[PDB]
Design a protein around this ligand. Structure first.
Ligand SMILES: O=P(O)(O)OC[C@H]1O[C@@](O)(COP(=O)(O)O)[C@@H](O)[C@@H]1O
Ligand SMILES: O=P(O)(O)OC[C@H]1O[C@@](O)(COP(=O)(O)O)[C@@H](O)[C@@H]1O
Lengths: 320, 320, 320, 320
């Protein structure tokens, strides 16, 4: 069997800026890519980041890394629109959803005409808003548009529930839901290490009336800002997440991960993107786990998912 | 060869809540995904969990992680409906099978219309019930609907048969069968470390009339509840299982794993989903190993698989 | 879903001699192959090298390894023509390009008729010459014919820029360009460890007028010959490179690697194969990074790429 | 904290011939060594095999590889006497135990004087005989002298019990015991895939009176000879085993592996080395699992372990 291009995986990066360059480096070492295409409106930083990354191969599982546009854009198995991103930070704001939504067109339309047929994976803030955005333009169904969000707020959470105690991460379970900052509510009602559970039977009850808890998610959600100093680089933690997430869909792991899905009354919030522990495989997401939120984390959810449906509604008015 | 989207793996997570966010993190690091799409009825927690996970990439094998709906839902190679989950806990109850079964429609129908053609991987409790559920709506054959179950009760079991002795996990063999809690019966009749076997030749016989055994599965099946305290987070152990399981189908490993399959008189229980050590590869499951259950673990099985066929029957009555 | 052959990766080795047997061993352990087919004009060394490699599986990610010909030659995802090699050594000589070019026909034609549709990956010296050769017969486009070259001269370079200092490899950046021996010029003008740079700001300027440098590439390019003694085995270093490279295309990593690409005025050398830091993914290569060579490494390039265009021209005269 | 040599692992290879060069290549890629020292009575093949292996590092976890003698011989964490080997093949013969036993002195004494304090790992045939040999000279206790043997006869066995059926290796359990060829007896009485068992309940009983079985260990133990043709290279399968085994002791995995241990009435064979499924960790072996051999595999054992105690006795008469 003859003339070639042995891939049978493809991934397209749409930002060889920070997050992207890192997503790249990981995808190179963790070894989850069989040809990687790197875009962003420059070309210089991409012939550079390639002749580096591609040098960084005799110590890793081989591929080919280039620089793209959107011709080399089909043959893909994943597309990652990693910080196809505007400038007003995050905390699902209002008019942010504008300054993107044309640099979300300028790059969603031509990765479609060539013959996309995969999963989009938009980690480009504000996320929840965005993946609804990335949905509506693409025509692409209620899963192939995978969001992101939650992933990098739980990973944090975990590793403060961590260091408090001794237990390794990857043991230690608990989520975050809603969006990404300013809304979030830790599902403490789940919260476990080792099959245990924090404060129903053992560590006792409330949050604010005891001295101890909560404090450490008043510095998980604030934990971006606190490194929107020393570089600006909330850029590792995320890229290393877009890799877990990306290895999961594509390796076909029938995994478990929080990521802004599409909500059909897999709560009662419906027709936003906001997110939750869902299950992702090659095709896209298949089945969204829903959570007894107690009575309070039900509220907290209900008033996240409301504050989108106002930034999601004042903006899906396309004609730039 | 031109315009792009190098994937050739795809995974769709349907709950970027707890289990999902974790399934995600793993799939990012263990490196089994080539584009991951993250859903759940929010959008906020998903643009968040993405711009984290996708940051968490320069230290891992690259992809793209987004937020979905069900358009970006084909191109998939796996779908993981990870805690597409209602609120009454687990122990295959009765009416539980209702409060889901519409948030199992609200998310099974649109991951079908786009053109799903893969394996479903529902880890969304109660499992056994559910994957029959996920079967009947999908039309999708008696394997492509992979269940879950058993996996996270054997992994526990193993690691108490473990710590008792010294032997590493991954040595140490023994299963659990039936469902998930309140029915289970450890196949002690298999039970080995090192090619040995526990209590036919060496460690002597019965269970309850000696002092020693059993006790430690009276705290494997109870081992969920005991961390339905300290968080609620029976959320790591599982996600790390949906990864083994997910790497297996998709990497095409012709593996061995317990997971709620479909029973044709691969016992005599037939036409539930309940489960057993079966064998899974890219396509789906191919061949279900059946076990000389002795005379007692035959009974125990027979009366698990009965207690579904009453929760499975009082509920498959679809029209919400 | 029924009757089987779960692969969805395929790799065909066209030399179960040295380099090949090693490429094999790696591909077995690093775990980048889902069925491997092994050829070379014998059959004995291949039923041998298989019933070894295939034994070397309970400690690795499973597949199937056989012995081929060119019927079992489609279904492939990569073909590696690993030392489809004649006897006059390397340093892109002249008439070498003859003694191959019929054992490059004897094996390129029948891996085409069966229905090849992938990437060729020829690491069979002289390389640059060869992949133009492997191109012209195949009809297969300007990427699916991936070369090799450069990879194993940079990896060396790196690990002398290394041991001098302390810094690990995989940190340490710098390339080699041109071909493979006797032409090469290290892009010192890039050359960095840690974001630093060697001798523009810190370590001062020239090469030959100071005492120190250069010396250690007068023993990188000579570093083949110096192990064309103690065995002849310039056979590990390379095979471990065909693995990085091979994992890259196929895993779809949108990577960065030097490998003889095809030059369209991605310099001004055009219509040879000579090479540079390019970017490779499943499909083939997508986008070739080009380098400000300064004023001298521009010359050095220009007079590599000239010395082919004389061995490339005196020989593409096919009719054996 | 100052002036350096960050290792905290050390491994010494005592044959940079075939098996060794391979053990090396693996230890380089699987990444289980933090400085490797390579010996064998040459020096040429070792400066060669190093300036290859050490080139084969920008695609792997860094170390330092040299060429030794026995000064650079302490600081070690393991010593592997990999084919410190004479010429009459294997099948624990008689006088073989002579032609070694002085090239087992010529190399055991000086890796002792420097201040060895670890595990010996002799995979140098005949093994069983040898590790008793390597014991008696060293003074080193009844575990730190780890043998080898069995490992590469079970791995084979497994992968014929395999290919017959579909199940991946690493599932599939069953051992081999005794020595290494011409004595061996498969513990079929254990023999399982998936928790099942071959021929007590399902596949029916005897061996020779049915047509089917046995045949495929009449070509596991003969499976060396059959590649003592096509090269001679029973050299991969083994080296990839000395890696599993070596990662196990040193990573401290409290693992399970067959390897010629020391038998105290962990049967009734006592005071040979012959072997069985034992358990190995950093220090050495801790606890040897013993097996209900039925009534026949008891005999077969008893008459392996007898045929040493005649080659082990006619030779431990040291004074060359
Ligand atoms: O688990 P390790 O120690 O690597 O043993 C590997 C070999 O051991 C076996 O004898 C089976 O061991 P387990 O049943 O405890 O997993 C053989 O089938 C494997 O190839
Ligand atoms: O080998 P996989 O498919 O990963 O199964 C993992 C689990 O399976 C087991 O039930 C034992 O499987 P094997 O005896 O074939 O190795 C449980 O002990 C493990 O944790």
């Amino acid at each position: 069997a003859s003339i070639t291009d042995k891939d049978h995986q493809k991934v397209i990066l749409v930002g060889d800026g920070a997050v992207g360059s890192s997503y790249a480096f990981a995808m190179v070492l963790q070894g989850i890519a069989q040809e990687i295409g790197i875009v962003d409106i420059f070309k210089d930083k991409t012939k550079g980041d390639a002749i580096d990354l591609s040098n960084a191969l005799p110590f890793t599982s081989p591929k080919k890394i280039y620089s793209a546009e959107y011709s080399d854009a089909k043959d893909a198995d994943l597309v990652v629109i990693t910080a196809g991103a505007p400038k007003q930070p995050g905390e699902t704001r209002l008019d942010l959803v504008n300054k993107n939504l044309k640099i979300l067109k300028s790059i969603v339309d031509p990765i479609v005409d060539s013959g996309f047929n995969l999963i989009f994976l938009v980690a480009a803030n504000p996320v929840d808003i965005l993946t609804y955005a990335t949905w509506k333009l693409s025509g692409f169904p209620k899963n192939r548009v995978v969001g992101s969000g939650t992933s990098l707020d739980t990973a944090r959470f975990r590793q403060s529930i961590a260091e408090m105690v001794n237990v390794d991460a990857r043991s230690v379970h608990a989520y975050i839901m809603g969006e990404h900052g300013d809304t979030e509510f830790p599902v403490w009602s789940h919260a476990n290490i080792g099959g245990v559970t924090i404060a129903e039977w053992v560590k006792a009850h409330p949050e604010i009336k005891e001295d101890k808890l909560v404090k450490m998610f008043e510095d998980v959600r604030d934990a971006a800002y606190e490194i929107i100093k020393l570089k600006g680089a909330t850029f590792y933690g995320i890229a290393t997440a877009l890799a877990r997430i990306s290895k999961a869909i594509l390796n076909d792991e029938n995994a478990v991960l929080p990521l802004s899905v599409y909500m059909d009354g897999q709560y009662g919030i419906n027709d936003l993107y906001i997110g939750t522990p869902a299950v992702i495989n090659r095709n896209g997401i298949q089945n969204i786990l829903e959570i007894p939120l107690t009575d309070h984390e039900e509220e907290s959810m209900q008033k996240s998912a409301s504050q989108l449906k106002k930034v999601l509604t004042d903006a899906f008015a396309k004609n730039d």
